[PDB]
Amino acid sequence: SEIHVRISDFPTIYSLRELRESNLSSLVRVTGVVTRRTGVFPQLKYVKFNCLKCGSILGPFFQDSNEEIRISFCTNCKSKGPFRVNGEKTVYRNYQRVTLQEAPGTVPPGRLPRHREVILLADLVDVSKPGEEVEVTGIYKNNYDGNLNAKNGFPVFATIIEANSIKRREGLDVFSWTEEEEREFRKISRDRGIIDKIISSMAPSIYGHRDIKTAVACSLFGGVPKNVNGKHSIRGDINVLLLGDPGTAKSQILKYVEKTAHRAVFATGQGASAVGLTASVRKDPITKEWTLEGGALVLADKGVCLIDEFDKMNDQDRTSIHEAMEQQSISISKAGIVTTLQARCSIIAAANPNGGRYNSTLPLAQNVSLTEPILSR
Amino acid sequence: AVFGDRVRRFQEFLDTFTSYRDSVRSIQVYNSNNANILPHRIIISLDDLREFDRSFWSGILVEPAYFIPPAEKALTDLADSMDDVPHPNASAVSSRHPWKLSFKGSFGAHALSPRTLTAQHLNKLVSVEGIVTKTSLVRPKLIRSVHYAAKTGRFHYRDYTDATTTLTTRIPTPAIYPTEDTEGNKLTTEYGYSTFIDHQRITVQEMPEMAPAGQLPRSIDVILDDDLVDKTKPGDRVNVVGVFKSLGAGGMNQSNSNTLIGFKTLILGNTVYPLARQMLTDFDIRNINKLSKKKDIFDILSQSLAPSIYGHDHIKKAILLMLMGGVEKNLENGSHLRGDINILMVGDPSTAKSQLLRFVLNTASLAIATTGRGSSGVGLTAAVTTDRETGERRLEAGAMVLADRGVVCIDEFDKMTDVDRVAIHEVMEQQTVTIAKAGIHTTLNARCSVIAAANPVFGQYDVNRDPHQNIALPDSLLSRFDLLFVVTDDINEIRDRSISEHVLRTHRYLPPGYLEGEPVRSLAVGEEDHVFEKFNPLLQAGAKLAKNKGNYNGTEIP
Amino acid sequence: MSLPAHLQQTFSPEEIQFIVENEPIKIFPRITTRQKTRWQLITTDDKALNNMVAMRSTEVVLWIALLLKQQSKCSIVAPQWLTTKELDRKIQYEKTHPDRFSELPWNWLVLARILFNKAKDDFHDPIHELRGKIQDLREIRQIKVLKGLKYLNESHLQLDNLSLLEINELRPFITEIMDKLREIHTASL
Amino acid sequence: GYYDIDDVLADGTEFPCKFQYDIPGLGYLENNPGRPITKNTKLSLPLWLARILAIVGPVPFVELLPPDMFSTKVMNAIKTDPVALDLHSINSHFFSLAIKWIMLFSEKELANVVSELLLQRAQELNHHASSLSIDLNANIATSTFLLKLEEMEKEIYKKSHESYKDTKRWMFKK
Amino acid sequence: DDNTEIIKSFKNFILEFRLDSQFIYRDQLRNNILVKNYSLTVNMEHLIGYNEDIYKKLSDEPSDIIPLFETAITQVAKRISILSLPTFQLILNSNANQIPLRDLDSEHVSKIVRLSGIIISTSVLSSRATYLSIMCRNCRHTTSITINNFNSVSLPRSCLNCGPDPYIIIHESSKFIDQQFLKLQEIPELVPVGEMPRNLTMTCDRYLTNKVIPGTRVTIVGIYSIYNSVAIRTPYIKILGIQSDVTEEEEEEFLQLSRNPKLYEILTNSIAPSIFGNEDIKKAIVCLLMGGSKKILPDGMRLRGDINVLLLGDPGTAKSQLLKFVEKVSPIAVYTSGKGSSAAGLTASVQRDPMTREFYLEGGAMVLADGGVVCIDEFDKMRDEDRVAIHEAMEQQTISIAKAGITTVLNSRTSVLAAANPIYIDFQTTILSRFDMIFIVKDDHNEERDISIANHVINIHTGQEENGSEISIEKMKRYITYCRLKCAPRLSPQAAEKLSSNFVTIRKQLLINELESTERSSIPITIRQLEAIIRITESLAKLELSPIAQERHVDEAIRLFQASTMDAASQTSLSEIRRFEQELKRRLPIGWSTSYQTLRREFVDTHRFSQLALDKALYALEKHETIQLRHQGQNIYRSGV
C-alpha cells in the first residue's frame, strides 16, 4: 500500500564533524562506518489512544520515529486526565537503529571520531552489518531530551538521522559481473597457458619468488569442501605459511592479496587477541539482553584470514587459531550465550625464523617456535 | 456455621482417641513442673483420622485452608479446658500461643518432590522430600501488640496478619503501632507483653539421583515459624509437610507490565522430618571391662579395624593408638606439650592407602577427607574471603580448624602447594591458628591428629634411598609427623590369588531384589553377637591370617 | 493347541457376525421364483425361496438376503427400529432413565454395520443421520456401562437388555475380575 | 494349577520363618552344610517348604512370622489411595501370595482390604484398556500406570485390550 | 450472538466430521477424557475440508476465535462423558509453508505461522491464573473474574467509598495452570554468511509443557504476537503445537538384527567407516559406546561401570575424526576441545544469577554429558587444574561443588574418550592408570599399507554397502539406546574363574619377564587395571543382548586389553638419575645460579644423561625445595641443602 521514494545521489556530501544547527530538518548525505546495530522490532505506524476518566477513545495519529505521541487534553470528555494505549487493531512497521562513526582515515591527525545514531524504518532493516563503510542519505532531525538537559545543564536537543537510503562504499561493486563479462572469462580460460598467466599476473611489482606466487594463487582460488553422508567432512581451504629472511617481500604480498580477495581480514600478531579473533559480547540498548559480536575469523568466513608477524603472537592466541585451522568452527561460552559459530576461511601467515635468520643446516623444527601440530596443519 | 461443625467434629475425634489427649496433658504437666520448654504442638496420624471420618480426612488432604484452622481451635479449646494453672502471668495472659498441628502417616499421590510440584497441587497438603541448600536468618515476626493507656488505666491490644502466617486470606494489616486510643487518650507500647514469633525461609532442592538425565535440579521455598525455626542446616535431607500456596499479585496488578510471568508459590511448613556419641548403658561398661581384662585385647582391637586388608598389621595397631591419642599436658608457664599422634603413609600404588583412610574415617568420631590436591570445597586451612561486589569479609574455616579435638584424614599429601605447606607447618607446630588479615584478628584452636598418604615422586618406592628422598617434602614437614611408615607392594603368588578372588567376589555380588544382574536401580523421627562378630569369609578374610601369624593353612577363627 | 489362544472361553467378532446372519429378514424380490432347479437348503427353510414374486415382500435369512443383494436381485427391507424416529425415541428413553438400559434388539450393532455397508441405498432416511444417532446411542451406553462396572461383587450381576457386542466386549474383564473376587472371598471363609 | 508357570513362580518366593526345634543335618537350609540348626532361629525359606513345615509337625517345625508385604504400612498405603500405589515393587505376585496367605490362616481382615484394592485398581485398569488410538493424520499416563501392574493385572489388561482392539477393528473395517 | 453461532459451528464440526466410517474427533475426545487427558488435537486440513469459512475466521483473528473453540470442545466433552472438567486445550497440526525464523517481521503480527528451529534453553514451570477470586478492601465485596491466556486481564480499578485498586486476591479459592518459556534459534543452515543466529522467545501452557529439551530440532505452530516490555514492542510466539523430529515393529527389527551371527564385526565396521586400519581402537570405541553394566552395593560402595579410553599417538592419525564420529553416533554426546574451554567448560563452575543475584551452580561439559559420552580432544593443552578436576569427576562421577552460598551437588555419570598428543612429568603415569585403556597408534612403514591408505583416501575423494555389513548412524543410535536401556548383563561363574586365572597368568608372565636379578619390574598389573579388564566383557554381552557373558567375551576382552595397555606401558634409569642429581648438587654451591640451557649443554648435549632424565631429576629436586626454577625454568638457583 506504500511505495517509499529514495534519493540516490545527493550532490552535497557532509561528514559527522561538519554537521551544525543549520542542517537541521534537511536532506544530508554523510559517510561513515557502522560500529553498532540492534535487532529488528515492530513499531506502531498509527496509534489510537483512550481515556481513563471517561473511557473515550482518541482518533488515529502518526507516530514519529524520534518522539512518542503525547496528549495533554482530550476531545470527547475534554478533561486533562490520564490516558492509555488501546485499539488492538493497529498497523506496525519494522524499526532498527545503528551507530554510524566517521571513517578512521577521514579523521584529521589524532582526533576523536564523531558518531551519530541512524534510524532504519521498514524496507531498510538488515541492509548493513557492523564493520561496513556506508553512505546514509536522510533527514537530520532533532528532539527534546530531558536527560541531556539535566546532565549538561543547558537546553540541548538530541539529534538523530532518519535514514532514507543506504549505500555501500567503481560503480557499486567490482566483484559483481555481468552476462557479457561471463562470456569473456570463458574465452580467456580457453588459453592454453592461462594458469601461467594467472600466476605471473599476481603481484607483478614483485620480481622473484615464483613459488610464493604459485602457493598464494592456489590459496586465493581455494578448494572444494567435501562431505560424505554427513559422517566425514573434508576442508576445502588451503593454508600457506611464509617463512624467510627479513627483506623478501612478504608483508607486501599479504597486503596485495588483502585487496584482491573478496572478503579478507588483516590482523598482525602483536595487535591481536583471542577475544578479538573469536567474538565479543555487547548489551543491546533496546532489549537490554546480551548479544554476541563477530570476530576476525568470523568476519572472514568463505574468504581469507591474513596474519602478519605470526611468530610474535602469544601462545593463547595461537591456540585460538588451531580450532579454525582444522575444525573450521569456533566455540564460545560467555554470559550464558553458549553456541557454535561458523568459520570456514583460509589462513595465510607470514613470519621470520627464530633468531632472525634461517639456518639452512638445521631443520624447520628448531628454526620456528611454532609447535609440530600447527606446522603440520 | 460450618466452622463450628468442623470444630465439634474434631473435638469428637480427639475425644475418641485418648493418645492425643494424653500427649497434650503430658506436655502441659512437663511445662508446669519445669517452672527446656516443650512446644505447643501435637502430631496426628492421617490414618487414624481416615479411619474415624473419611470426610474430614479428605478435607484436610484436599482443602487444608478450610479444614485445618478448625482442628487447631478444637485442640486449643481442649488444652485450655484441661489447663489447671492456678495463677497466670502478664506474659502468659496476653501471649498469642495457640496449639499447632502436625501430620504423620501415609500420604497418597500427595507424596511428591520439588520437581513434581505443579499448579494442580496448589491449596493441598503435600509432603516434599529433598535437600536443604539455603537457610535464611531467624527473624522475629509481629503478631500482637499490647498498649497501655495511663489516663484510663486500661490495657489495649491489636492483632496483625500476613499472607505467610495464615492459611485463610485476610486484609493485610500494616505494622504500624497504634498511637492514640479511640477516645483520644495517648497510648504507650508495652514491649514485654507483646507477642513475636520467629520466621525462617529455607529452600529444598531435589535429590540429585532422582533428577532426570540432562536436567538441572529444581527447588521450592519453604516457610517455617515458631518452634520449627532452627531444625535444619544446609546439605541435610528432610521431609517437609506443608500446604502449597500462591502469594502476591503475580503481575496481575496494573502497575506491572510483564504480563507473562506467573505467581510466586511456596510451602507453609507444618513439620520437618530429618532423613557422634552412643550413650553407654550399665552393662556396656561391664562388657568393656570384660574385654579389657583379657590379656590379648590389643591385637583384637587392632585387627578388628579394617579386617579385610591383608598384612600391614603394625599400621592398624598404630592407627588405633593414634585414634585413642595421649594425655595432653598444660604447664603453668603456658607451655603446651603436644599429646596427639600423627601418622604418614608412603608407598607404591595399590596398597589400600585409600582403604585405610576410609576405615579410619568410618571408625573415627571426627574426620574430614580434604585431599591435598586443590581441596575444592573446604580448604585445608582457614582463609578469609570477600564477596565480588559487596566485599563481605568473613573468616572461612578450613579442614584443620574443623577437627578440633578430633582427627583430619588428609589424602594425597604429595600434591600440596607451597601455600598449604607453609600453613600446615605452622598449624601442626603451634596447634593453633591466629588470623591477622583483612582487619580481622582472632585465634582459633586446631588441636587434632593428622593422618595422610603420599605417593613417591617417581611413582615407585626405591629402597636404596631414604624415605625423605622418596618423598619431596622438607624436613620441617616430615619431622612433625611422629611416626613415618614406608610400605611396598610385594608380589606373592598366594597373595595375588587371595586379592584377586576377594576383589572378584564383589562384582558377582549383586543388588538382591530384582532379576539377578539386570538394569540396576525413616519410620519415626522422635526415637552375645552384639559385642563379638561372627566370622565372615567374604569380609574378614585376611583377619584370619592375622591370628594365624601369616600362615594361610591356619584355621584359627579370630 | 487344537484351539487358538484368543478363542478360549470367549468369542470373536467374526463369529458374532456369523451368529447374527442366522436370523430372518424381509426383502423385496426382483425375480419370480414361484412356478405357474429350485432351492433345497438343509439348515434353513427352502419353501419361501422357491415361492417369491417380484415386488412382493417375503422373509428369508439375512445371509441369503445379502447373497441376493450381491447380485442385485432383491431390495432389503430396513427393520422398523433402524428408522430415525425410533432412534430419537430410544435416545430420549436412555436419557430419561440414568440407571436402566434401553430395549433395542440384541443385534442392533452388527446389523447396523452390515446394512450400512452392504445396503447403502435401501433406507428411507439419510444415512448420516442414522450414523450420528447410532453413535450417540453407543456413547450413552458406554457411559452407563462404565458407571455400572463399579458394582462388581462375589455373588452375581444383572445387565438387562444389553446387546451381544457389548457383552462380548466386556466378557474377559468382568469375568476375570469377578472370578478373582470370588476366589478371595472363598479363601476367606 | 499344577502346570501353570505363574502359579509355580509364586510358590518360589521367600517367606520368613522361625525354627522352634533343634534338628541336625539341616545346615544347608540356613547357609552352610554339615551344621546342626539350633532352635528359636530365624531364617528365610521358600513357600513350598515353609507351608508344609508349618502344617506338619502337636508342635509345628516352623512358625511363620508376619511377612513384610502384609505389614501395617502396606495396609495403610492400600487403604489410603489404591490407584497410585505401586504393587509391582512390593511383589510381582502380590495377589496370588495374598490369597495363599488368607487360605492358610483364614484371616477375615485381609480379605476385605484385598478385595477393595482389586476393585479400585480394576476400575482404572478398564479405564486405560478401553482408550485406543486413532490415526487421524492418515499415552504417557498409560505407560506410567502400566509399569505399576501386578502379573495377574497385566494378564487381565492384555486380554481386555486385545478384545477391545479386535472389536474396534471389526466395527470400523472398510 | 456471533460468539454463540461460532461455538455452535465448532460443535457441529466436531460432532459431524467423519472420513470413512469412524468419527475421528468424537472418539479421540472420548479416549482422551478416559485417561484424564484434557486436550484435543485437530488437523487444520480437516477443518478446511469441512467448512472453509470456519478456517477463514480462525486464521483471521486467532486470539479471539481460539477460546471459543476451547469452549465448544469443553461443552462437547461434557456432553460425551457426563450423563445428563476444566476448560480443554486446543492443539493444532498444520502443513502450511514454513516461514524462516529470520524472515518474521511486522507483516505477520497476530497471525498463525509455522516455523522450525533448535531449542537452546528452557525455563521452569510457572503458575498462570485462570480463575481469580477477588475481595474488596473496604466494603468486602466478593467477585470472580475468569482469564484466558490469549491476548489480542487485570484487577478492577473501580469497585463493583473504595479507592483505586481496592481488590485483593483470595488465593485459597483460585485455580492456576502451568506455563513455560523456551528459546528458539534459527537453523544453522539458513544463517546467512557473516551474520549471527537470531533467537525468539516462546510460551507454552498446560499439556504442551515438558515436551522438549535443549538441542532438539522442533517445528512450531503458534501465534506471532507482541508484548510490551520509542514506541517499540518485543516479539514472541504463543505455541499451539509442537512436532519434534525425535512401538513393537522396531523391536522385532532390532531382535532380528541381534540374531545376525556377525553382529560384533558389523558394529566394529560401522565405527568410522571412512578411517582405515586401527581395528583395535575401533573395537575399543565400540565397547566404550556400549559401556559397562552398573554395579551398586547395599553398603554404599558402588563400583563404576562406564568405560574411558586414551588415544595417544603422533599427528596425522585421525584421532579427531574418530572422536567426531563417536560424538555423532552416540545418542547423547558432547564434543569439546580441551584448550578451547576451561574449568568452567568441564565439570562445573559456581556462578551468580544476575537477575536475582544469588550464587548458583552451572554444570560443565560433563554435566551436560550425563548419561552419555564426552569426547575430549587435545588432552595435553588442557590446564593441569582442569585435568585434576576431570580426574575427580571420573573418579566419582559426581562433581562435588557445594559451597559459596549453596551446597548443591550434581551427577556426572559419563564416559570419557581422550585423545592426547605424544608426550614428546605433566602426563604422569597416574592419570594414565586412571584410564581403563591406553592406545599408542603407530602406522608401520609398509609399502603395501601406504598404498592401501592412499587408495582408500582417493576413493573417499572420488566418492555404501548397507546390505548386511554396515548400518547407518540412525539405526546404530537407536540400537545403542535400546541396548543401554534394556539389557544389563552380568558375567558367568566359569568366566569369572577363567578371568581370575588369566590375571594369575599375567602376573606369572611378568614373573617370567623379570629375568633381571637386581633390576625391578615397574608393574605387572594393578588392581584398578584388573577392574578395567572387567566391565568390557559386560559391554560385549550387552552388544549381543546375551544375558550372561560367556568365555568368548572373556578372551575378546583379554586380547583387547593386551593389545592396548600392556604393550603401551612397556613401550637402571633411576640409578642414573641418582648420579645426575649428585652431580647437579655438587656443581652448584648454595646461592649460585646457572642457566638451565647451560646445564642441558653440560649434560644432555654431552649425552651423559638423556633429556627424559633431566626433567625428571629437576622436578624431583625442585619439589623438595633444594633447587628453584627461574625464568620459566631457564635458570636454576639452589635454595639450600
Ligand SMILES: Nc1ncnc2c1ncn2[C@@H]1O[C@H](COP(=O)(O)OP(=O)(O)OP(=O)(O)O)[C@@H](O)[C@H]1O
Ligand atoms: N623481489 C622483490 N621485488 C621487489 N621489491 C622487493 C623484493 N623483495 C623485497 N622487496 C622490497 O623489500 C621491502 C621489504 O618490505 P616488505 O613490506 O615487503 O617486507 P619486510 O618488512 O621486509 O618483511 P618481514 O615481515 O619478513 O620483515 C619492500 O619495499 C619490498 O618492495
Ligand SMILES: Nc1ncnc2c1ncn2[C@@H]1O[C@H](COP(=O)(O)OP(=O)(O)OP(=O)(O)O)[C@@H](O)[C@H]1O
Ligand atoms: N593388603 C590388601 N588386601 C586386599 N586388597 C588390597 C590390599 N592392598 C591393596 N589392595 C587392593 O588395592 C586396590 C587399590 O586400592 P587403592 O585405590 O586405595 O590404592 P592406593 O595405593 O591407595 O592408590 P593410589 O596409588 O592411586 O594412591 C583396592 O581395591 C584393594 O582391593
Ligand SMILES: Nc1ncnc2c1ncn2[C@@H]1O[C@H](COP(=O)(O)OP(=O)(O)OP(=O)(O)O)[C@@H](O)[C@H]1O
Ligand atoms: N587411515 C586414515 N584414513 C583417513 N584419514 C586418515 C587416516 N589416518 C589419518 N588420517 C587423517 O586424519 C585427518 C583428521 O584427523 P587429524 O589428523 O586431525 O587427527 P590428529 O592426528 O589427532 O590431529 P593432530 O594430532 O594434528 O591434532 C584427516 O585429514 C586424514 O586424512
Ligand SMILES: [Mg+2]
Ligand atoms: Mg612485515
Ligand SMILES: [Mg+2]
Ligand atoms: Mg590410592
Ligand SMILES: [Mg+2]
Ligand atoms: Mg586432532
Ligand SMILES: [Zn+2]
Ligand atoms: Zn477523555
Ligand SMILES: [Zn+2]
Ligand atoms: Zn468496595
